Amino acid sequence: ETSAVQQKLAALEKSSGGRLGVALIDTADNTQVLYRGDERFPMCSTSKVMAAAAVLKQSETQKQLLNQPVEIKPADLVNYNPIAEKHVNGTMTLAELSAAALQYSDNTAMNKLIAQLGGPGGVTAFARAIGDETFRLDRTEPTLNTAIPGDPRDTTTPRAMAQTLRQLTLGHALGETQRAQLVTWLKGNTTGAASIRAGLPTSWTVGDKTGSGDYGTTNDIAVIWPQGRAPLVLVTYFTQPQQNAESRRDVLASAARIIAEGL
Ligand SMILES: *[B]([O])([O])[C]([C][C]([C])[C])[N]C(=O)[C]([C]C1=[C][C]=[C][C]=[C]1)[N]C(=O)C1=[C]N=[C][C]=N1
Ligand SMILES: [Cl-]
């Protein structure tokens, strides 16, 4: 059985030509609205949230960990290094790496977070520790973006990611200083203007993390504070049947516009 919300999302999916996954959690009453909410999708750069959160968790017991400088070598650079390239043969702290990964989607920064956690499996272990049984990170940047249909590597479901994003930002999977820091980072994101944010009222505060990959994969996950109302969490994942498909951030904006009706 479908609601009008799910019917609108299905029509958007049909017009888009791809596969759309949506999960909305309304924290006023803990209700969820799902569309393909238990299907796996490639996370691409939305996985940077889990990596940054895992480092934040380590910092709860190592109080100066975020200020620890990490060396950036020429050989560390990968395909998209807008911040890290300014620090070659220098350093970035774990806080600076987290901010670069989250707010600019820097892939060298993400790889340093993964390395701090002992590899992709360390990010997955953190997910399991906070109750996320679905997330899996298998690869570093940039190979985590291959986004092959049917491949479970580097995937999660919309429901699982929405639940985790809620617990990380509004709940207490992290300590208070750390939860607030993650919110500060997400709110300052620079890459999200055409994605979920473009489908919501400008008066709503949004923290989000985008992602992109092969198969035209176009993703965004967000924590949202509507005016006068309890906050929401929204995941919008989108992937397409052909490898060379173009990005479709407009589909995410359209999904957000649908979800916002009545909220
Ligand atoms: B993330 O893992 O989603 C990451 C963020 C991006 C801004 C650097 N994405 C990528 O590394 C993708 C992978 C990709 C592979 C094949 C097809 C499409 C995408 N890279 C990019 O989107 C990209 C775009 N412009 C410059 C650099 N990188
Ligand atoms: Cl991105």
Residue numbers in the entry: 25 to 57, 59 to 238, 240 to 289
Text taken from the publication that reported this structure:
We have utilized class A enzyme CTX-M-14 from Klebsiella pneumoniae as a model system, because it is the most widely distributed extended-spectrum β-lactamase (ESBL) globally. The clinical usefulness of β-lactam-based antibiotics has been significantly shortened by the emergence of specific bacterial enzymes referred to as β-lactamases (BL), able to hydrolyze and functionally inactivate β-lactam antibiotics. In this study we show the crystal structures of the β-lactamase CTX-M-14 with covalently bound Bortezomib and Ixazomib at high resolutions of 1.3 and 1.1 Å, respectively. Ixazomib is well defined in electron density whereas Bortezomib show some disorder which corresponds to weaker inhibition efficiency observed for Ixazomib. Both inhibitors mimic the deacylation transition state of β-lactam hydrolysis, because they replace the deacylating water molecule.
Bortezomib can be written as Pyz-Phe-boroLeu, which stands for pyrazinoic acid, phenylalanine and leucine with a boronic acid instead of a carboxylic acid. Bortezomib and Ixazomib bind to the active site of CTX-M-14 to the catalytic side chain of Ser70 forming an ester with the boroLeu warhead. Based on the high resolution and the quality of the data, we were able to refine and to compare the occupancy of Bortezomib and Ixazomib bound to the active site. Both inhibitors are observed with full occupancy, but the N-terminal end of Bortezomib is disordered due to conformational alternatives. We see a different conformation of Bortezomib beginning at the central Cα atom of the inhibitors. The Pyz-Phe moiety is less well defined in the electron density map. Obviously, the Pyz-Phe moiety is not stabilized by any specific interactions and can adopt alternative but quite similar conformations. The Phe reveals non-polar interactions with Gly238 and Asp240. The Pyz ring occupies a similar space as the acyl group of several β-lactams and is highly solvent exposed. The inhibition assays with CTX-M-14 revealed an IC50 value of 13 ± 1.2 µM for Ixazomib, but 67 ± 1.4 µM for Bortezomib. The fivefold weaker inhibition rate of Bortezomib resembles quite nicely the observation of an elevated degree of disorder for the Pyz-Phe moiety of Bortezomib.
